[PDB]
Write a protein that binds this ligand. Structure first.
Ligand SMILES: NC1CCCCCC1
Ligand SMILES: [Ca+2]
Length: 223
C-alpha cells in the first residue's frame, strides 16, 4: 500500500496473508473454512495465516492453517486478468473471534463514489521498494467506469473496477495482490492489477466481487 496508514493490530480481522515460505499475497476470510483471493495468486503449498499484524513476528493472535484445495475461476484469463478470483479452502476451520472474522459478500454491486478500505502488506513505495511488516490500510473511492476505461483503454472488462486517485500517490502495490476492498462492510473488490503503483492517471484495478457471488456460494456448497 502506497500513501496509506498503519491499520493497527487486528483491526482488519478478515485480512489474511498467504504464505509459501514467505508472504506473497493477501486474501479475505469469507467463512470459517474459505478464503477469497486473486487467481493470479494461485500456487501450490499455500498456508493461510489469519490474525496477523506483523507478518515477521509471532504476536499471539495468529492461526496458521494449510490450504486443502484451491479453486481458480473457470474463466480466469491470466493475460487479460479477466475473472481474477480464486477460492482457497482451509484444511481445518478457523476459530472465529474479534480478531479473526469473516467479511460478508455483497448483495449488490457498489457504485462509483463509494468509499472503501483497501489493505495489505505490499510495497509502500511507488518508485523503489520497501515492504512493511505490519498491515497497511488505504481509504479510497470507487471510480466511474468511464474514468477507469479512459485510464486504461481496451483493458477494463465488466468484471473490473478502478478505485483510488487519478492524481496518484495513494494505491495498492506489489504484495497487496489478492487482498480486500471492503465498502460498507461488504467485500466488493480483490486487489488485481494496475500500471505501476500510485502513478498519475493509473489507479488500481480490482476484481468486481459482486459478479461472482453465485459462483462463490455454489462452489462453497459443493466443495
Ligand atoms: N495496484 C496494483 C496492485 C496489484 C499488483 C500490481 C501492482 C499495482
Ligand atoms: Ca505475526
Amino acid at each position: 500500500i502506497v500513501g496509506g496508514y498503519t491499520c493497527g493490530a487486528n483491526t482488519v480481522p478478515y485480512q489474511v496473508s498467504l504464505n509459501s515460505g514467505y508472504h506473497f499475497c493477501g486474501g479475505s476470510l469469507i467463512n470459517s473454512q474459505w478464503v477469497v483471493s486473486a487467481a493470479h495468486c494461485y500456487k501450490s503449498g499455500i498456508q493461510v495465516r489469519l490474525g496477523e499484524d506483523n507478518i515477521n513476528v509471532v504476536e499471539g493472535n495468529e492461526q496458521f492453517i494449510s490450504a486443502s484445495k484451491s479453486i481458480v475461476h473457470p474463466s480466469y484469463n491470466s493475460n487479460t486478468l479477466n475473472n481474477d478470483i480464486m477460492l482457497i479452502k482451509l484444511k481445518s476451520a478457523a476459530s472465529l473471534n474479534s480478531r479473526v472474522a469473516s467479511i460478508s459478500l455483497p448483495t449488490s454491486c457498489a457504485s462509483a463514489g463509494t468509499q472503501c478500505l483497501i489493505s495489505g502488506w505490499g510495497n509502500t513505495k511507488s518508485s523503489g521498494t520497501s515492504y512493511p511488516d505490519v498491515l497497511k490500510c488505504l481509504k479510497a473511492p470507487i471510480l466511474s467506469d468511464s474514468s477507469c476505461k479512459s485510464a486504461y483503454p481496451g483493458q477494463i472488462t465488466s468484471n473490473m473496477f478502478c478505485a483510488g486517485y487519478l492524481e496518484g500517490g495513494k494505491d495498492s502495490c506489489q504484495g497487496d495482490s489478492g487482498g480486500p476492498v471492503v465498502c460498507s462492510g461488504k467485500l466488493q473488490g480483490i486487489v488485481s492489477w494496475g500500471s505501476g503503483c500510485a502513478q498519475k492517471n493509473k489507479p488500481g484495478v480490482y476484481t468486481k466481487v459482486c459478479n461472482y457471488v453465485s459462483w462463490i456460494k455454489q462452489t462453497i456448497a459443493s466443495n
